[PDB]
Design a protein around this motif. Sequence first.
Motif, PDB file in Angstrom:
ATOM      1  N   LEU A   1      33.058  -2.939 -23.179  1.00  0.00           N
ATOM      2  CA  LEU A   1      33.480  -3.802 -22.049  1.00  0.00           C
ATOM      3  C   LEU A   1      33.648  -5.228 -22.543  1.00  0.00           C
ATOM      4  CD1 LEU A   1      34.313  -4.135 -19.320  1.00  0.00           C
ATOM      5  CD2 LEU A   1      32.007  -3.765 -18.474  1.00  0.00           C
ATOM      6  N   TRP A   2      32.752  -5.726 -23.385  1.00  0.00           N
ATOM      7  CA  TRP A   2      33.000  -7.058 -23.981  1.00  0.00           C
ATOM      8  C   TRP A   2      34.415  -7.068 -24.521  1.00  0.00           C
ATOM      9  CZ3 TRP A   2      33.758  -8.306 -29.329  1.00  0.00           C
ATOM     10  CH2 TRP A   2      33.942  -9.669 -29.552  1.00  0.00           C
TER      11      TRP A   2
ATOM     12  N   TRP B   1      39.642  -9.297 -24.222  1.00  0.00           N
ATOM     13  CA  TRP B   1      41.074  -9.294 -24.465  1.00  0.00           C
ATOM     14  C   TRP B   1      41.845  -9.599 -23.175  1.00  0.00           C
ATOM     15  CZ3 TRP B   1      43.868 -10.071 -28.419  1.00  0.00           C
ATOM     16  CH2 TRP B   1      45.215  -9.716 -28.423  1.00  0.00           C
ATOM     17  N   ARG B   2      41.486  -8.934 -22.102  1.00  0.00           N
ATOM     18  CA  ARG B   2      42.251  -9.126 -20.858  1.00  0.00           C
ATOM     19  C   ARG B   2      41.991 -10.526 -20.326  1.00  0.00           C
ATOM     20  NH1 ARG B   2      42.762  -4.175 -22.302  1.00  0.00           N
ATOM     21  NH2 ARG B   2      43.295  -2.526 -20.809  1.00  0.00           N
ATOM     22  N   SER B   3      40.752 -11.007 -20.382  1.00  0.00           N
ATOM     23  CA  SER B   3      40.498 -12.303 -19.777  1.00  0.00           C
ATOM     24  C   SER B   3      40.985 -13.462 -20.633  1.00  0.00           C
ATOM     25  CB  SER B   3      39.016 -12.482 -19.520  1.00  0.00           C
ATOM     26  OG  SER B   3      38.714 -13.873 -19.394  1.00  0.00           O
TER      27      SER B   3
ATOM     28  N   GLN C   1      46.252 -15.931 -20.430  1.00  0.00           N
ATOM     29  CA  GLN C   1      47.236 -16.838 -21.028  1.00  0.00           C
ATOM     30  C   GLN C   1      48.640 -16.318 -20.793  1.00  0.00           C
ATOM     31  OE1 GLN C   1      46.833 -17.721 -25.257  1.00  0.00           O
ATOM     32  NE2 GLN C   1      44.774 -18.489 -25.126  1.00  0.00           N
ATOM     33  N   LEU C   2      48.807 -15.003 -20.886  1.00  0.00           N
ATOM     34  CA  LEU C   2      50.124 -14.408 -20.764  1.00  0.00           C
ATOM     35  C   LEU C   2      50.709 -14.551 -19.361  1.00  0.00           C
ATOM     36  CD1 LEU C   2      50.023 -11.502 -23.224  1.00  0.00           C
ATOM     37  CD2 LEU C   2      51.299 -13.714 -23.229  1.00  0.00           C
ATOM     38  N   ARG C   3      49.858 -14.635 -18.322  1.00  0.00           N
ATOM     39  CA  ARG C   3      50.345 -14.529 -16.940  1.00  0.00           C
ATOM     40  C   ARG C   3      51.446 -15.546 -16.567  1.00  0.00           C
ATOM     41  NH1 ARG C   3      49.079 -11.853 -11.957  1.00  0.00           N
ATOM     42  NH2 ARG C   3      50.157 -13.041 -10.340  1.00  0.00           N
TER      43      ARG C   3
ATOM     44  N   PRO D   1      48.964  -5.820 -17.711  1.00  0.00           N
ATOM     45  CA  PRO D   1      50.106  -5.180 -18.404  1.00  0.00           C
ATOM     46  C   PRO D   1      50.511  -5.903 -19.682  1.00  0.00           C
ATOM     47  CG  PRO D   1      50.553  -5.251 -16.091  1.00  0.00           C
ATOM     48  CD  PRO D   1      49.286  -6.060 -16.294  1.00  0.00           C
ATOM     49  N   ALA D   2      50.615  -7.226 -19.630  1.00  0.00           N
ATOM     50  CA  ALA D   2      51.059  -7.931 -20.826  1.00  0.00           C
ATOM     51  C   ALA D   2      50.013  -7.982 -21.947  1.00  0.00           C
ATOM     52  CB  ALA D   2      51.485  -9.340 -20.438  1.00  0.00           C
ATOM     53  N   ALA D   3      48.821  -7.431 -21.738  1.00  0.00           N
ATOM     54  CA  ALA D   3      47.832  -7.257 -22.788  1.00  0.00           C
ATOM     55  C   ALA D   3      48.139  -6.063 -23.690  1.00  0.00           C
ATOM     56  CB  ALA D   3      46.442  -7.101 -22.164  1.00  0.00           C
TER      57      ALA D   3
END
Lengths: 131, 595
Positions: free
Chosen positions: B144-145, B150-152, B157-159, B482-484
Amino acid sequence: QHTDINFTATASFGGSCYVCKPHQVNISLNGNTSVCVRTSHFSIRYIYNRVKSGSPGDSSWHIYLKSGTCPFSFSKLNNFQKFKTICFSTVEVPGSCNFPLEATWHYTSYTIVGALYVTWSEGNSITGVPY
Amino acid sequence: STTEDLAKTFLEKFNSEAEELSHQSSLASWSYNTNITDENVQKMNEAGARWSAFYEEQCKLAKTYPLEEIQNLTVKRQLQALQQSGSSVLSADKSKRLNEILNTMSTIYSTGKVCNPSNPQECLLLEPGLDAIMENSKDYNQRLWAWEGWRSEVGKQLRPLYEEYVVLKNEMARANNYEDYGDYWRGDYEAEGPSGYDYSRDQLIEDVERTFAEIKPLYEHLHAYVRAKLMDTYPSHINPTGCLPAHLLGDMWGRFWTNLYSLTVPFGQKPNIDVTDAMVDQSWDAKRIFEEAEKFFVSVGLPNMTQGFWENSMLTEPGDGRKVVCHPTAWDLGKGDFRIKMCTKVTMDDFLTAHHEMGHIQYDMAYAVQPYLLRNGANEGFHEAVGEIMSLSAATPNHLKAIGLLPPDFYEDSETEINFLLKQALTIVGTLPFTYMLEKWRWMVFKGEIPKEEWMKKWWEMKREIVGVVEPVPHDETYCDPAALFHVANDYSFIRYYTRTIYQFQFQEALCQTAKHEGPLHKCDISNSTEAGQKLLQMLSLGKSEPWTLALERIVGVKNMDVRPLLNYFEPLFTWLKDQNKNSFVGWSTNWSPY
Ligand SMILES: *[C@@H]1O[C@H](CO)[C@@H](O[C@@H]2O[C@H](CO)[C@@H](O)[C@H](O)[C@H]2NC(C)=O)[C@H](O)[C@H]1NC(C)=O
Ligand SMILES: *[C@@H]1O[C@H](CO[C@@H]2O[C@@H](C)[C@@H](O)[C@@H](O)[C@@H]2O)[C@@H](O)[C@H](O)[C@H]1NC(C)=O
Ligand SMILES: *[C@@H]1O[C@H](CO)[C@@H](O)[C@H](O)[C@H]1NC(C)=O
């Protein structure tokens, strides 16, 4: 004396279908189209020379010759065989042995690009030294 | 002279200036992708700006040549192709923004780091550390880390970028006269073609959905079985009726469940289908892998790899400290230059991957006999299917034996049959609902069925319904998960990885009947079948010269996707799972979540 004959195929490979045939392939018996051996001893070697194309697709391009219409193997000519006349030409001449010159992209399609023409009268005056 | 003759003039011109500029653009993308350095980025850009210039100019100089007026169905094909395309209908300013957004998303992904909260100097990238956690780890909280980090810290940043990116690619789409970027993409699957062969781009959805519904049961049972086992490993984290926590699936995404084999193998005392351990016990190096792959391809009568391939491929991560891109790709640089780029490791995965990637090189070699504009796979699925056919034959335990990677006394029995078809379901059947969802989301975001204020809501609403996978942690719309995933941040259509999967069995059926194989097709190893080699090569070398529908009819019976060979491949497994699940709760609830 002793005569060397370099039989050289120089080829360039670009064009439309890089893989299908070579673009241009010049063929030469010593920088001319015709050589007659006039010395007691002679050697003949086949030289293949690509031009630079900026593509490692070169070297998958093989141009080599084939066993033709005559009782000689190109390599057998240099191995102490004997003749009275022996002449080499680039273009078909009357009554000749034909060593066809096939080109190929990495053994896909095979495509004949010329031939070496040999004319001979058997004798014991001319020798093929291999050195 | 005849307008068709006057357009052949155009085509001949194109097919000369192109094959130089292509190769030179390709050669500079290689160098960057083989040596990321700011001066190799520069050179890459310049040469591709030379290519873009020419291509978009000659697109417009080809629209001047009307298509009804041309009758030769090669010069029609070639022209149609030039004409259509071009992110070229955009303001010089708005074109330049896209490319900054695109290159930024790419390098944010390339360089994203997620950082130990214990040691702030220890800070990890997907390749190589975070993917290694998510592939190997069994620790719920370490997974989970990574999964969350990665997602956070990069998905967020990608959003903002992603939002601009949809706006402008939607603009590029509608200004080349498509409905939305989603439509622009679905037109890899458009055929005009002959009579009885056309295919529109709104039938891709219909047919994807039709064929997916038919998969859904085999997938449901697979799902039941693996949540059942995963409980044995993460008890108290996995509800025997809920979806499966996302961080637990093998990837940073669960694109494939393959790396869950350890934990889900039915009969583990048997010799290991996953041949990673054998490879390592026999000192298999990357050279060994690629040689063995080559030798497969030769045995079916398809060529060996060119000297240039062995001189200039990059088959491991280089040791000179260069930073390179590892995402495995099979380059056709043109002019007969063929390469692979691939940071290879000793894994049954990169072994199968080497077969796949060398299959790409074979379609690439084959169609080089076709005019420049037609030397592409028929659709994007065909290319990746031809690749996966090789893995199909190369992963069957029989071929594993004859390679050496199963002990000489090995003999198949109904338990190892089920073992094999479980791994090969984790990998194949597993990625099917992922691929459908990700692109339904994309296509729908593109249509604008899904506004910005639901981008992550709908994602996890759909991931919980279609896929059976639940976020472990709440994600607000500050995230763009998604962009991850590589393909999304690097602007790649993803539906190819679905169509590939229905085809790869259609094709395998065909070749096996031509390989005069009797019995179950999951025991087909077209290896040593030169006749099946020929049949395959005959499509390969058509390239794009024919509709993809016509190209199916040649090798397979039909002119459209058919899920039947896939169901038959997996029928053994279907029956064992259905038994192995009777006293279980098959299906999920979109309501439970780990939080
Ligand atoms: C369509 O036009 C192409 C040329 O653009 C034709 O291809 C030629 O076919 C002849 C067959 O004898 C060859 O000799 C030529 O070398 C080919 N190309 C050239 C350079 O003209 C093709 O046959 C035509 N027909 C269709 C419908 O495919
Ligand atoms: C590739 O193979 C070459 C030998 O070619 C073999 O025989 C020809 C007629 C075809 O059947 C071909 O497919 C066979 O492999 C070698 O000379 C060459 O070195 C090999 N290239 C490399 C570097 O792998
Ligand atoms: C990598 O690129 C740099 C220039 O950016 C160049 O000087 C160097 O030689 C390249 N290294 C290799 C081995 O390609």
